[PDB]
Amino acid sequence: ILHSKRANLYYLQHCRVLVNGGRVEYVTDEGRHSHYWNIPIANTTSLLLGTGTSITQAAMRELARAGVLVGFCGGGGTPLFSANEVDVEVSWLTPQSEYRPTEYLQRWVGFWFDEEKRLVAARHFQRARLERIRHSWLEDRVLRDAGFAVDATALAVAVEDSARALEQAPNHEHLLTEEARLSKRLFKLAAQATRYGEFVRAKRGSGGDPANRFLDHGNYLAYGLAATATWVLGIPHGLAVLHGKTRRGGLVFDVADLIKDSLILPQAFLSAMRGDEEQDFRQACLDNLSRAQALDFMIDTLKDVAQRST
DNA sequence: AAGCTTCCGACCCTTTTTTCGGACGATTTAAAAAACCCTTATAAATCAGCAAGTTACGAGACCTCGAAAAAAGAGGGTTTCTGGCGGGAAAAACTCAAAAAACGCTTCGAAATCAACCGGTTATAGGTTTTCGGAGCTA
DSSP, X not given: OEEETTTTEEEEOSEEEEEETTEEEEEETTGGGOGGGGOOOSTTOEEEEOSSEEEOHHHHHHHHHHTOBOEEEOGGGOSEEEEOOOOBOOSSOOOOSOOOOBOHHHHHHHXXXXXXXXXXXXXXXXXXXXXXXXXXXXXXXXXXXXXXXXXXXXXXHHHHHHHHHHTOOSSHHHHHHHHHHHHHHHHHHHHHHHTOOOOOOOOTTOOOSHHHHHHHHHHHHHHHHHHHHHHHHTOOTTOOSSSOTTOTTHHHHHHHHHHIIIIIHHHHHHHHHHTOOHHHHHHXXXXXXXXXXXXXXXXXXXXXXXXXXX
């Protein structure tokens, strides 16, 4: 249930959170034996209330006493609906509320306005993304066994070439387009491996074939996971690195990018070819995300870029 | 002392909850009615297989009504495909005009010519092979 070992983030489902006798208690079908009792309550913990759960104001009081962030997310924890805002660590605020302020916003803003540094960040994002493609498509054979048998030499050549291109070109405007070309080739490779036939990527949900729908669902979950990552870091969604400065919710899409083609896309084609239900697809996606430590990776990346930007 | 405003008691009426009583059902117990047993030698039933005559139970059919399901009919709405009409821009006819350019006069003497047949010229109809442009695709 520990959703991110890097963030001390826990997912609670099928239980009520209430305060009896001055201690926050979980009313669950397992009673005393539920693992929720092992939840450490400290300023380092952060909760994610899941499906079928409710919380009492008294609990909110006790958690605030202990300084524990709370957030509501849907099935499996991908769509993050609402959460507590996290503080910002600077010398002029200084409340004693015992809430672990986080300093990453200052680091982010310290460079966000300098375009050259912003570009350097974009490059760093894409380096990470490609290396996660090469990892999941080649190094690990779980997909191979599942049925996603694809050629390697063509994929390796394409990825090598795109990586070679990343280290070049002057502005965001090229990077976006280079990624788009890589995207197209990856789609073609996946369709060939899946024997799905010809594939064309419609957008704004105009597609009707299973592949398109499953891609949309997968991307929706990925966005939710990224939103969780940013919220844990406290960075507002508007300070995008690679998407346009006017794009509402740009940053989450920047962060979501580092898994779409690594983990969502193959599963979308696999499930479409296998003829799965939408529910089966959702469960498979969440299982893949859990297996890959996705949230932890996207946390590590954001921290790495912050430290590297100095 | 008077007027205004606010409680308070008395009451009137209907609805909602509780209590009690009565009735009905069910069960138990006791009393009454039907029944069982014990004495029978003699009269009637038991049964053997088949014939000859009859029918109580089963099957088939149809009707009757009622209800259920399905199909049709109605109405609410949204999306899109087409047609008609209106409006701006370009083309080409229409109107206005000049300046060439041709024609005629008009050429006696200089080419132009056709005819058949050879070799030779070369524009190009037709076919063959190939860059340029665009397909969009993808973030």
